Scaffold this motif. Sequence first.
Motif: not given
Lengths: 81, 30, 30, 34, 34, 504, 38, 341, 65, 39, 30, 37, 37, 34
Positions: F72, F77-78, F80, F82-83, F85, F174, F176
């Motif tokens: 992160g 942002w991240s 992967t 995402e938002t 976070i 995928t 993570s």
Amino acid sequence: TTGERPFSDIITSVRYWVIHSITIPALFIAGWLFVSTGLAYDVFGTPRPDSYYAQEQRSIPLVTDRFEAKQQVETFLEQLK
Amino acid sequence: METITYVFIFACIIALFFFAIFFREPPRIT
Amino acid sequence: METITYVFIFACIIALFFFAIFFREPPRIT
Amino acid sequence: MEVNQLGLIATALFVLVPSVFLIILYVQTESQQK
Amino acid sequence: MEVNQLGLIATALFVLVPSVFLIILYVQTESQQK
Amino acid sequence: GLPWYRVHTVLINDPGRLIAAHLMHTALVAGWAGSMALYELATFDPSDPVLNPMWRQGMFVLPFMARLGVTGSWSGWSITGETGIDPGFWSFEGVALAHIVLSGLLFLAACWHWVYWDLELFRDPRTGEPALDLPKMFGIHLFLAGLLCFGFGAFHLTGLFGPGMWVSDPYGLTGSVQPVAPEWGPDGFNPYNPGGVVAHHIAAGIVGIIAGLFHILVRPPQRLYKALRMGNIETVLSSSIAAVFFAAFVVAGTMWYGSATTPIELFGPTRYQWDSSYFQQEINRRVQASLASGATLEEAWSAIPEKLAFYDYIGNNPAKGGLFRTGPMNKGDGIAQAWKGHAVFRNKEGEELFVRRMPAFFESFPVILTDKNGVVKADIPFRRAESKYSFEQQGVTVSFYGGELNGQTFTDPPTVKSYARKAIFGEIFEFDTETLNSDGIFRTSPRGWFTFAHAVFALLFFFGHIWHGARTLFRDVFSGIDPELSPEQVEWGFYQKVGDVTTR
Amino acid sequence: SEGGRIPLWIVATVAGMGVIVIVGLFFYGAYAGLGSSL
Amino acid sequence: RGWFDILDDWLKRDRFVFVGWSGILLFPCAYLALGGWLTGTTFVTSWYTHGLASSYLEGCNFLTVAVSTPANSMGHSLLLLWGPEAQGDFTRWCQLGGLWTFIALHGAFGLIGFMLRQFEIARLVGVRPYNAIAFSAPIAVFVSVFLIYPLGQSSWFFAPSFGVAAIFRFLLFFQGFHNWTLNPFHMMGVAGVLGGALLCAIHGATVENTLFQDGEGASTFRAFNPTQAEETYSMVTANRFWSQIFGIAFSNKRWLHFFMLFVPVTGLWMSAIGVVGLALNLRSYDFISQEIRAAEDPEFETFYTKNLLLNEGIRAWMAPQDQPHENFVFPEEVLPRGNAL
Amino acid sequence: ARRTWLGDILRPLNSEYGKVAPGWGTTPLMAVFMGLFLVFLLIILEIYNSTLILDGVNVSWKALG
Amino acid sequence: TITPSLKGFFIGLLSGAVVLGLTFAVLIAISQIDKVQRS
Amino acid sequence: DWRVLVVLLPVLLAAGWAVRNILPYAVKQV
Amino acid sequence: MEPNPNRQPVELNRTSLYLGLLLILVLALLFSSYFFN
Amino acid sequence: MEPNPNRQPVELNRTSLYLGLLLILVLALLFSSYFFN
Amino acid sequence: SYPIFTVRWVAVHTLAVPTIFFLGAIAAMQFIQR
Ligand code: CLA
Ligand code: CLA
Ligand code: CLA
Ligand SMILES: C=Cc1c(C)c2cc3nc(c4c5[nH]c(cc6nc(cc1[nH]2)C(C)=C6CC)c(C)c5C(=O)[C@@H]4C(=O)OC)[C@@H](CCC(=O)OC/C=C(\C)CCC[C@H](C)CCC[C@H](C)CCCC(C)C)[C@@H]3C
Ligand SMILES: CCCCCCCCCCCCCCCC(=O)OC[C@H](COP(=O)(O)OC[C@@H](O)CO)OC(=O)CCCCCCCCCCCCCCC
Ligand SMILES: CC1=C(/C=C/C(C)=C/C=C/C(C)=C/C=C/C=C(C)/C=C/C=C(C)/C=C/C2=C(C)CCCC2(C)C)C(C)(C)CCC1
Ligand SMILES: CC1=C(/C=C/C(C)=C/C=C/C(C)=C/C=C/C=C(C)/C=C/C=C(C)/C=C/C2=C(C)CCCC2(C)C)C(C)(C)CCC1
Ligand SMILES: CCCCCCCCCCCCO[C@@H]1O[C@H](CO)[C@@H](O[C@H]2O[C@H](CO)[C@@H](O)[C@H](O)[C@H]2O)[C@H](O)[C@H]1O
Ligand SMILES: CCCCCCCS[C@@H]1O[C@H](CO)[C@@H](O)[C@H](O)[C@H]1O
Ligand SMILES: [Ca+2]
Ligand SMILES: [Ca+2]
Ligand SMILES: [Fe+2]
Ligand SMILES: [Mg+2]
């Protein structure tokens, strides 16, 4: 010097040649026969001049599978009928 | 700039030849 | 690269502060 | 020609940094007591 | 931003050449006897 | 005076200043890490983990932060995609800051140990001379390394008290960060099993603790003390250099062949996945499964993830680069924008034709199209005068399925040929070549650059080992041989045993 | 037996001639049978 | 004076061929690498791995025999005789290319053995181990070319095969596919080898032509005693000669001989770095500015673009037979060719 | 030389310079471990190399999903 | 389970141990027999 | 395989012969 | 502060200066084309 | 060759080095914006 | 006065025996016809 007999002595000695006038030709003849009997071909799996291809084949018997490579080569050899 | 750089390095090397030869530390016998 | 330059120069100036203070030539009384 | 724009600074520092290193060592050697 | 492409090498040499001149002078001073 | 290549030898009998120099080296390295992360954050585009992931952007330390669970940004942002976070302090920015501060503190410590070099601790209590008890030091440091290794495995990687590590599916779709449990069966020694990395650090940690205690409590045998010159710090230099080039060859290797610790979402795909058409095979499998479930061709190919298709493209092969082709992959073919979809080629008779793919070895490659049996059906000819297989002569068309060109068909020879040309690289993509002034020439990924630097450094450290091993074992003569060396020692047969005067 | 009975120069000459013979054979084989291009 | 020391005693006896602890590693591995090469080149084919004849038995000569690398499909298999591929069959193992890994691996450990020998003897005789140190360059070259390079590539297949013409092929392949001559690390290599050769030549000739008359003979070799204290040639005359001929001259003998170590050793190390790059296809293949210009301007021509045309020829004309696992079929019409030829 | 608090504390940890155990001491045991370590490496290499192939150990990306 | 390649690995291991063992047995034996003379 | 005996008969005949001729000196040495 | 007994003077004679500058300048002449690319 | 009697040793003390470096670095920090423009 | 079976003896023969055998083979090969 390091204790061994000089080579000059040995190779110019009569006994050396009594021994080696037998042992060297023996070895030479042995290698000769290793070829002439055809044993070399079989030991090392080398094609004789008539065993590179079957009669109407023109595709190299390239090994394409790592773990069944042995079986591949064997099949290739059978393919020479 | 490339040409200038290449020629500049070459020029420095030639100057170096000159100093290395005419302004060397003289060999001295002992 | 402009930003890197500005920050580089600044950083060098701070370093210089450090040496000029803690690694100054010590004043000595005669 | 569309050359790399860092090429110049690269060549310049590549020459100057070590050359300067050597010049510093040489000059401070000369100045040592003969 | 669209900066002058020679700004980088100009600034670098602006710093390095006289800084190096001074470092040479300083070090050859320290290496002198006494 | 000391020649330039020996200036640092003044540290050999000054433990304090040696520690200072080491502090300064460590400061410089932490400072590099901090600086590098700051630069990558100032240049990284987080907006598209699918077609513009970190390994396309020349990111070298970002994937190492990600591997252990820093994913992160404070900016929200991240990696992967995402938002919203909250990464807490330990974002990329936090890690960089931490390294900068560490660097500062190490600097200050270095100044202290340089100035106060003459600590009684560094003096042999009996002789008053500087001395370091290297065997016991080794015990202590090995014990500490053991503890740290064990804790890293048992708490960090497990997620017990820590984030875990990066894991993914076999096609890097995928990925993570997850807690990973140790693997204690034989599969633990499978490089693609992360459970083995866990179990490794736990077991090797315990072993390091035990061995460390041993080396703290038991003195070296006199015969090994003498043979390895354990009173001399350079011996440690030689064997350490050896351990280090071993480790460097290992990380070069696992980076190039791939493992649980070199995920393709962080470093890019491997060359061997191109060689064996790993991704193409999985794509074909999925498309087939789709058709067999009753889907249309368009539907089947439209169901293929762009990320998957993007792996099946030679521009992401780490073996397509150049030593002086600098920067991110994006600087070459461009910033990937979208899958154009799968190209199917057909001739006038409506036979499907398949473009022969470029192997990694080839900077350029011809354009040849065969049927499903490898029979040549069309090509782009060099000499035209005796062409038999030109696209014009064979009436080659291209129809696209999935992607942006889905459901479209092209029949004009130039367009068809352009697409065939791209088909030699695998799946076809639209690129933005303008943003970076990309030049259209393939560059390697971080997998490639890492592998290169570390195989090279490993090779050079072999020489380091040789040199310092030599310096250690031949210390007595490295200023010259005995000026009174008796001719009888090097004569033949004067001694029964070479260099053994008691054997006259 | 005693060393020096057979003159080293004779041994050398004979050995050399043998070498020339076997190599001569190998060059003969470059033109006959396998490897001859014929 | 227990068994270890008795053994040490025996290993270090001053005999015609010194053995040493290092001899235990060195002699069997060197013997197996040599014997493996001779066995392979005398009796063993390359039909099943390359579609090539490679032995005397098949009709090859000294220049064309080789122990060839395994099929590309073997990947980087150690290809042990007892491994999952040969499964203990000596004949199959030969047919699969087992002798290549046999020779390279025994060879590598043999080189380790020999360098260890250099250390061991130097230690026993009381000299500094600079010979061993120099030998690190051969090591770097062997390990980069025969181990790292194929390890970076798809398989052992693209390693060099052990044969004269096979090596020549390795060279031509590196030109065609890697543009290896363009590589500055190779160039440093060339400078070290040719410079080494030059130093060898010039030092030998200089010593031989500044000799002191230390005898009455017109053949001057006998006028030297190994035990003598004096220099056998004039360093002062040598120095003045080269100073007046070339502008500069050695004046320090120790520096001269160190330099003679330094030049070829460094050259070889650099070449090694380059090949480590080529393991990943990390080539110095192109100059991007060259290509942008040439692509836009069809009248722009240099020797660099000329050589790439040559490379393109090499790849297209050699690949189908040189890379049979790829099953390349390049129809006549797609082969790159200039006019008439 | 200068004494410090922390220095005085650590002093014993750096006071046995040159101290050895008589003769060969634990060298045989060490040798054993070396042997084991060799075999260990030989194993992982061969597993990674697909020369040694074990049940449940699939050396590929497709090891686990 | 002992697969064919694990069995092959044991054979390789064993063969190596035999080669090294015979080597050092013979070397130690010969060293024992022909000792260096010291005074 | 008769070929291995027909081929390695000269080798073992040579070994046996030289053993015969060198036996006394070998015994004297051992 | 008490003086450190481990200090040593450093030297680079003129011939080493010349050799070094040759190495640097020639390495630069060699590598610059690649830096410009 | 007779040595030249007009020669003179040169000095730059440490404080002068710090002043000089400060001058150069601050000049650079000032003019660099204008060099990039 | 001299030993017969030495380290040198072994070395020498490990090279010389196979060499003569091999030369016999290659000799034979010169009369193989396709
Ligand atoms: C472990 C080392 C390492 C590796 C593998 C990487 C990898 C990467 N870096 Mg990073 N970087 C590093 C250390 C490393 N970096 C260090 C130490 C710095 C501080 C200078 C940086 C600063 C940095 C910046 C500013 C950038 C990168 C970028 C990148 C990416 C592009 C790489 C590239 O173009 O290289 C090109 C490699 C070469 C051209 C090879 C050079 C070979 C040298 C010149 C040989 C020297 C020869 C020598 C003189 C011979 C002497 C002989 C003598 C002994 C006789 C890539 C992912 C780029 C990126 O994409 O950012 C997102 C980028 O912009 N890096
Ligand atoms: C753990 C790593 C390590 C450490 C701590 C040392 C330490 C030492 N080395 Mg060893 N060495 C190493 C690895 C190491 N070496 C490696 C990998 C090699 C092969 C390249 C060598 C080859 C070597 C030789 C041939 C010699 C030494 C010598 C020495 C001693 C003096 C060093 C000196 O004053 O240089 C002073 C160096 C300079 C003033 C400038 C060097 C500039 C370099 C060449 C280019 C720039 C380097 C760059 C900053 C590196 C960035 C980091 C890198 C990891 C990428 C010192 C004990 C010397 C010795 O034994 O003297 C008795 C000596 O002759 N080393
Ligand atoms: C010191 C000399 C030496 C060295 C370093 C090597 C090294 C090698 N040989 Mg060579 N070889 C040698 C002498 C040597 N050999 C000799 C004298 C012969 C004639 C017999 C051979 C004949 C030979 C053949 C036919 C082959 C090799 C092969 C190899 C390679 C694989 C070896 C391996 O995996 O061993 C594994 C074994 C060890 C590493 C031994 C270590 C044992 C530990 C330390 C002790 C524990 C043992 C334990 C108690 C036993 C329990 C057994 C139980 C589980 C059943 C390796 C490069 C193979 C090859 O090159 O393939 C391409 C191959 O096919 N060698
Ligand atoms: C192709 C070029 C080349 C060859 C053939 C070569 C050969 C040799 N160099 C040696 C030494 C050296 N070479 C040195 C510097 C250099 N050497 C160079 C290049 C070469 N050096 C260069 C360019 C340099 C300058 C840096 C030094 C400093 C030394 C030594 O000290 C040493 C020596 O004593 O020289 C007098 C000897 C080592 C003997 C040995 O290891 O026994 C053991 C034999 C073993 C371990 C077998 C190795 C098996 C090899 C690695 C693979 C198998 C090879 C096949 C058997 C043959 C294949 C043939 C085909 C390729 C056609 C040997 C005569
Ligand atoms: C007589 C045969 C001559 C062969 C060609 C010349 C070889 C020597 C030339 C090298 C010059 C080097 C630079 C000067 C180096 C230099 O100054 O030399 C000096 C050296 C010593 O000189 P001297 O004064 O002691 O003796 C020469 C005369 O003065 C007569 O005594 O000269 C010789 O040794 C002559 C050797 C003749 C015999 C040499 C035969 C060697 C080659 C045999 C053929 C090999 C072919 C292989 C092909 C596969
Ligand atoms: C004091 C202080 C501080 C601060 C600190 C800081 C700010 C730091 C920084 C630091 C830094 C910021 C650092 C950096 C570093 C860097 C480095 C160290 C780099 C290096 C590099 C190199 C070495 C490279 C090389 C190369 C090249 C150039 C080319 C290619 C190849 C190679 C890679 C080799 C604080 C406040 C915290 C606190 C305490 C006090
Ligand atoms: C591989 C292997 C092995 C091994 C084997 C061996 C060890 C072998 C050896 C072998 C040998 C050891 C052989 C040899 C041969 C030789 C030859 C074949 C030679 C020839 C020669 C010639 C031909 C000469 C020439 C010349 C020259 C060089 C120069 C001078 C002149 C003339 C021309 C004369 C074993 C069983 C362990 C295991 C399995 C694998
Ligand atoms: C941007 C890139 C620039 C690269 C810069 C590289 C910096 C290199 C710094 C070199 C440091 C030189 O180190 C310098 O050595 C000399 C001797 O050699 C020392 O000099 C000392 O020795 C000499 C000779 O006995 C005495 O006459 C002198 O009185 C004594 O102080 C200096 O006290 C020291 O400052
Ligand atoms: C030197 C700078 C120190 C700044 C410290 C800021 C603390 S920030 C704080 O950290 C916690 C741990 O990650 C998080 O749980 C929390 O959400 C976050 O706000
Ligand atoms: Ca453009
Ligand atoms: Ca016929
Ligand atoms: Fe000389
Ligand atoms: Mg013939």
